[PDB]
Enzyme design. Structure first.
Site, PDB file in Angstrom:
ATOM      1  N   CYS A 203      -1.747   3.641   0.945  1.00 15.64           N
ATOM      2  CA  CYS A 203      -1.589   4.093   2.201  1.00 15.64           C
ATOM      3  C   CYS A 203      -0.043   4.888   2.306  1.00 15.64           C
ATOM      4  O   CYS A 203       0.693   5.104   1.500  1.00 15.64           O
ATOM      5  CB  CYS A 203      -1.508   3.239   3.406  1.00 15.64           C
ATOM      6  SG  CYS A 203      -0.020   2.044   3.135  1.00 15.64           S
TER       7      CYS A 203
ATOM      8  N   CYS B 203       0.813  -1.236  -0.115  1.00 17.03           N
ATOM      9  CA  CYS B 203       0.046   0.080   0.112  1.00 17.03           C
ATOM     10  C   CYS B 203       0.857   1.217  -0.072  1.00 17.03           C
ATOM     11  O   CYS B 203       0.537   2.525  -0.605  1.00 17.03           O
ATOM     12  CB  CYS B 203      -1.109  -0.100   1.183  1.00 17.03           C
ATOM     13  SG  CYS B 203      -0.301   0.210   2.921  1.00 17.03           S
TER      14      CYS B 203
END
Length: 252
Positions: free
Chosen positions: A157, A75
């Site tokens: 992320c 991520c």
């Protein structure tokens, strides 16, 4: 015909064979997808658009395919791009420092391909497919990219990177997949920073394009989502790539 139904190019020749082959190749190379049944992937891809009016495709049509191509992505290593896909891909190919959508099974299957069907026949249309501008936005290809791109953005992320084409009149384009979908689907709970790399097209000693009005726009949008924005110029993408392959010892 001297006149086609739609204004866009028709389905890529040997589409079914091409997607199937890509699925086999991907699942052979990428160990986490080792177990995917590529016939099943083709059936679900086909089910999204065959026998459907190619101006009436929805995200739901692609859900069987999305389920099948479910895949974990690191991520914190996501690279988004707009109008500069070749450099994005050449960069990630060096040592897999980041992952683009085309590094995922679904992005890999569909990259550079066109496809559409016909209402109430099961035929693929190799003659023409809807143009996003002239004909309709809800066409099999546009809907696929919007669907997959949204999911890819939702998975990001930490620090997310985006390569932008600094030789365009709109370096950040609110109408692109990046600007219209990915920016608005990064999750502020997870994503700390969006860092843009503005790729120069110039001959040398160019402007600081991080000050471009369209970059300021992107900064404003992203800041207002409670995500930090960073921008860097890449003045010479040829030197950049060299430094990625062979860092620190020479002029980098």
């Amino acid at each position: 015909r001297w006149r086609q139904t739609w204004s866009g190019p028709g389905t890529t020749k040997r589409f079914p064979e091409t997607v199937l082959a890509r699925c086999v190749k991907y699942t052979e190379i990428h160990p986490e997808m080792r177990h995917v049944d590529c016939q099943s992937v083709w059936d679900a891809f086909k089910g999204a658009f065959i026998s459907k009016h190619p101006c009436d495709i929805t995200e739901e049509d692609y859900q069987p395919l999305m389920k099948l191509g479910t895949q974990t992505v690191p991520c914190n290593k996501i690279l988004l791009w707009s109008r500069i896909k070749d450099l994005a891909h050449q960069f990630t190919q060096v040592q897999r420092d980041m992952f683009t959508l085309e590094d995922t099974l679904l992005g890999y299957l569909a990259d550079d391909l066109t496809w559409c069907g016909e209402f109430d026949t099961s035929k693929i249309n190799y003659q023409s497919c809807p143009d996003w501008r002239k004909d309709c936005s809800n066409n099999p290809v546009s809907v696929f990219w919007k669907t997959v791109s949204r999911r890819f953005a939702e998975a990001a992320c930490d620090v997310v990177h985006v390569m932008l084409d600094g030789s365009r009149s709109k370096i950040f384009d609110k109408d692109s997949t990046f600007g219209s979908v990915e920016v608005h689907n990064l999750q502020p709970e997870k994503v700390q920073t969006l860092e843009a790399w503005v790729i120069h097209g110039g001959r040398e000693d160019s402007r600081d394009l991080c000050q471009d009005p369209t970059i300021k726009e992107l900064e404003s949008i992203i800041s207002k989502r409670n995500i930090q924005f960073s921008c860097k110029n890449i003045y010479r993408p040829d030197k950049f790539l060299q430094c990625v392959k062979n860092p620190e010892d020479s002029s980098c």
